[PDB]
Design a protein around this nucleic acid. Structure first.
Ligand SMILES: [Mg+2]
Ligand SMILES: [Mg+2]
Ligand SMILES: [Mg+2]
Ligand SMILES: [Mg+2]
Ligand SMILES: [Mg+2]
Ligand SMILES: [Mg+2]
Ligand SMILES: [Mg+2]
Ligand SMILES: [Mg+2]
Ligand SMILES: [Mg+2]
Ligand SMILES: [Mg+2]
Ligand SMILES: [Mg+2]
Ligand SMILES: [Mg+2]
Ligand SMILES: [Mg+2]
Ligand SMILES: [Mg+2]
Ligand SMILES: [Mg+2]
Ligand SMILES: [Mg+2]
Ligand SMILES: [Mg+2]
Ligand SMILES: [Mg+2]
Ligand SMILES: [Mg+2]
Ligand SMILES: [Mg+2]
Ligand SMILES: [Zn+2]
Lengths: 207, 122, 114, 54, 119
RNA sequence: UUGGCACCUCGAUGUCGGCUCAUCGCAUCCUGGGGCUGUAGUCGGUCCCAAGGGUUGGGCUGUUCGCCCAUUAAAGCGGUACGCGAGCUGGGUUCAGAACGUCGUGAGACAGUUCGGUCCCUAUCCGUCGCGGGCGCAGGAAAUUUGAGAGGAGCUGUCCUUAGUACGAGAGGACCGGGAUGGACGCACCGCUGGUGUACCAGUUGUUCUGCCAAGGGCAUCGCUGGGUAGCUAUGUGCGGACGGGAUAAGUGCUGAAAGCAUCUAAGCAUGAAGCCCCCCUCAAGAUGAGAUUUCCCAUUCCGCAAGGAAGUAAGAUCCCUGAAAGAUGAUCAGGUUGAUAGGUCUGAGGUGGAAGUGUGGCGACACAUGGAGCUGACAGAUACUAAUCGAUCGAGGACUUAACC
């Protein structure tokens, strides 16, 4: 497979030459750099680390600087791992650039959703409300709690709590256009995550 | 956004004037039906003549809706009244005339006869 | 923002005469029945011109056989041949929503050229 | 609802391990020599960030 | 966004207008922390209006500032003081006309107080 | 289910229907795989395996029941105090009022009918959903990870071809295999259509203030009406349940004796389902069995016979301060003067819709020009003008025993 890391920018439209409006997300990136090649004996598996979006030095400590020194580059900000991939197209210090995705491709997108804080049941799980009339005194509440016999509550009753803010994967999106100048990617549809956040793009696995 | 209990006014010389929606054909839930669909409906007001009598159960297609369809090229279209045309159990209409324009998502479907009988298609 | 700005503006269209809401104009749309490309002529009153950038749309409204019809487009679509302009009109709002009612009923509700 | 059983001393004392205060953030106004608190005006010296503030 | 200060919209606006005129008059007032933190972003806009200095901006400011007497022996009104004196003083400084200094907490309710003043 | 007994509860275990939320069994309603048929085909009938998922909107009655209308692939049967009232409702049910029918001489009565009729509780403990602090894991730290194990998801229609072919006098009309396109359900998101948008823009009534005109402020639900940025949103948009592998159930078998034959089996070898275990998505080393990899810091000073203890520090982190992609509070994330973290200023985006002043025309209300003007909360960029000052605290010196190599 193959994948890169990037940043979310925003959404807009483009016109296919057929003359069809298409919602488009704009994910930019910079040349990612391999940092470490996890072999099959030192580590019980096979993968590569990817760095991205270097930071100014005053924010980097000595351990991280030493870690990066093997690749001879500036200390990056995000460092992720990419597992299923051939391990001879890559050597530490190599650059990975956006041009590895032709148009009309099919890829997978992985991010982290945007938070919503403490949330009730009606919104967190999409339940129903009681009638708001006819003498009722019940609406926006999590319903009953179970039968009497167990003398307890089964593990699995859904209740209010902190909502959103976790990893999410969307599948089978199509690359629309690629710009090697601004280092951009244009994707049909829309991906999770708030603006100015990390975004992972990998080749489709369901294939 | 026609749904159960919505009232519509027919757009043909069948004899009925307005009609009431009973059920939306399709899957099991089918909360609603937009333009270019078929419903089952009962007549509420009819002209003294006409081939249809007041208080029956008939099938009809949807030709115009206030909320309107959305085409693939980003364009939209809308009307300002909900209309329908009675169906003779198959895409053939029952009346002979058609009043007011009809949408264009009918030709994409198999309603050739209607879209031919229309004064103008949009 | 500037990135979105230019990478979109590449596709912009630079032949449309300026026009404010509240003025009739003809539109030449390319409808295709799979074989040829008729050119439907649809003219009416500009009810609303909304949004900016490549997303800017507008709305035209007209009456035909008693019933009124609305129709919107994105201003930069290639589905449009050209846009004439029939008559300017003087108005005060920027959203002529009130026209949705005062159409028939002998209500001569029109505009006046500037 | 109602307390079904009284609470022992053990539980009462265990619950209160997190009910305490925090020593404030103190510093030294290097104009008078007393203990102001950070990012605030030394009400003793009446001075802050070198100069004075009437 | 912007704070609400636990008051109805109208009450909030009124309190803000009053604090503004009072600061223009005294040039150093003293109040709670968040209140001043909110107030500065209005005082600066008023000072900008004054720096522009024409009939239009003057009427705009008058539609916001109260009618108090700044220096009574001269019978100068707060608005005139603002325009003439302040505009003449902060003639060239590009924004950032105020400053905030934090005191300890109050006694009756432990609220943290602070001092706001013109630069 | 209708019953029988009277073992617990009368110093209180509150009924029937409906709402919200579900979960389990399988004697299966649909979808999956089969045997037989009085199965030509398309429909079927009956029996075997199978509980993964799915299983509706109204009319009439307080109603469960029941009948009816219209759809669907299907409109399953049961348990969980005839599930669930410290979660809701109170329609019927059984208090006090009144009336009718019948019985009683009478007060009254009826499991006859009808109208009206007070529903209390701030969550101590276990339990369920979320979020923190301490310590551990034989030195002290920063990152990236494997995955024992746990959860999620699992539905299905119509149409076109193969083909009017097989089959059938005819009527009618396929399996298998391809390809489009829906229903319901779920996840994410605000570019589009719309909603909201109480410190945005405009119009307008009454009254009262800024001495007066002109221009403005206050109050009247935000005074009312027309629009609307950012955020948050669905009815809006995008995508998903695909393709498969291994072992099986019912079934179908191959070879083959016991028993010269026969035989699916005893020894041997296969095939075989929406089930089972993987493939997909998420959590996950407090997995005390406390894992792995990469990088940084070093092995000070005092005491202490000794054992060990104490103090300054390294790498690093926190207190405090500016905040929001975060948020009930902690927490997380971006920054702290070699800096754009926030505010202001300048320039824009969008929103509203032609400011004031002056001039011209009109007797006047008003119109026109100066001029897409004026104004502008949250959005973009640049800009150190103001504020993140000075400081303080925490934080290693690496136990023994074996075997390798030395
Ligand atoms: Mg409901
Ligand atoms: Mg138990
Ligand atoms: Mg103590
Ligand atoms: Mg008010
Ligand atoms: Mg008791
Ligand atoms: Mg069974
Ligand atoms: Mg019950
Ligand atoms: Mg029982
Ligand atoms: Mg209960
Ligand atoms: Mg009585
Ligand atoms: Mg009588
Ligand atoms: Mg008698
Ligand atoms: Mg009653
Ligand atoms: Mg409660
Ligand atoms: Mg408690
Ligand atoms: Mg937007
Ligand atoms: Mg006046
Ligand atoms: Mg008053
Ligand atoms: Mg409004
Ligand atoms: Mg921001
Ligand atoms: Zn001091």
């Amino acid at each position: 497979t193959k994948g890169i890391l990037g940043r979310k920018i925003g959404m807009t439209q483009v016109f296919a030459e057929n003359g069809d409006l298409i919602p488009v997300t704009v994910i930019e990136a910079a040349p990612n750099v391999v940092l470490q090649k996890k072999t099959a004996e030192n580590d019980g598996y096979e993968a590569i680390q990817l760095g991205f979006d270097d930071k100014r030095e005053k924010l980097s400590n000595k351990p991280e600087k030493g870690h990066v020194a093997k690749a001879e580059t500036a200390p990056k900000r995000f460092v992720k791992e990419l597992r299923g991939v051939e391990m001879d197209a890559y050597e530490v210090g190599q650059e990975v650039k956006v041009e590895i995705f032709s148009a009309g491709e099919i890829v997978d997108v992985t991010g982290v959703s945007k938070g919503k804080g403490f949330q009730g049941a009606i919104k967190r799980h999409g339940q129903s409300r009681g009638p708001m009339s006819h003498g009722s005194r019940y609406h926006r509440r999590p319903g009953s709690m179970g039968p009497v016999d167990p003398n307890r509550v089964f593990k699995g009753k859904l209740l209010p709590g902190r909502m959103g803010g976790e990893q999410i994967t969307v599948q089978n999106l199509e690359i629309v256009k690629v710009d090697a100048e601004r280092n951009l990617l244009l994707i049909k549809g829309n991906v999770p995550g708030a603006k100015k956040s990390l975004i992972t793009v990998k080749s489709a696995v369901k294939s | 956004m026609i749904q159960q209990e919505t009232r519509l006014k027919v757009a043909d010389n069948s004899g009925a004037r307005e009609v009431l929606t009973i059920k939306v054909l399709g899957g099991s839930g089918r909360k609603t039906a937009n333009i270019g669909d078929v419903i089952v409906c009962t007549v509420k007001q009819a002209t003294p003549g006409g081939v249809v009598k007041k208080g029956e159960v008939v099938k009809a297609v949807i030709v115009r809706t206030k909320s309107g369809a959305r085409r693939s090229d980003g364009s939209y279209i809308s009307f300002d009244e909900n209309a329908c045309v009675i169906i003779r159990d198959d895409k053939s209409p029952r009346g002979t005339r058609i009043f007011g324009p009809v949408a264009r998502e009918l030709r994409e479907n198999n309603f050739m006869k209607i879209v031919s009988l229309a004064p103008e298609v949009i | 923002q500037k990135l979105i700005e230019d990478i979109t503006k590449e596709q912009l269209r630079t032949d449309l005469p300026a026009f404010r809401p509240g003025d009739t104009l003809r539109v030449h749309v390319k409808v295709v029945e799979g074989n040829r490309e008729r050119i439907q002529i649809f003219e009416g009153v500009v009810i609303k011109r909304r949004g900016g950038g490549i997303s800017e749309t507008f709305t035209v409204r007209k009456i035909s056989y008693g019933v009124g019809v609305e129709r919107t487009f994105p201003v930069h679509t290639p589905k449009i041949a050209k846009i004439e302009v029939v008559r300017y009109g003087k108005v005060r709002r920027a959203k002529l929503y009130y026209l949705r009612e005062l159409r028939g009923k002998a209500a001569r509700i029109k505009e006046i050229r500037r | 609802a109602v307390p079904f059983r009284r609470t022992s001393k053990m539980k009462k004392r265990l619950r209160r391990t997190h009910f305490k205060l925090n020593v404030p953030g103190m510093t030294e106004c290097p104009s008078c020599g007393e203990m102001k608190l950070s990012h605030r005006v030394c009400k003793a010296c009446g001075s802050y960030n070198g100069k004075d503030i009437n | 966004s912007y704070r609400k200060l636990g008051r109805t919209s109208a009450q909030r606006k009124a309190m803000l207008r009053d604090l503004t005129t009072d600061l223009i008059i005294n040039e150093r007032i003293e109040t709670t922390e968040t209140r001043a933190k909110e107030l500065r972003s209005v005082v600066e806009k008023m000072i900008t209006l004054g720096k522009r200095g024409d009939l239009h901006a003057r009427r705009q400011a008058a539609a916001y500032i109260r009618n108090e007497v700044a220096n009574e022996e001269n019978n100068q009104d707060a608005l005139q003081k603002l325009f003439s004196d302040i505009a003449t003083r902060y003639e060239e400084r590009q924004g950032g006309y105020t400053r905030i200094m934090k005191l300890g907490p109050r006694r009756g309710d432990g609220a943290p107080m602070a001092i706001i003043e013109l630069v």
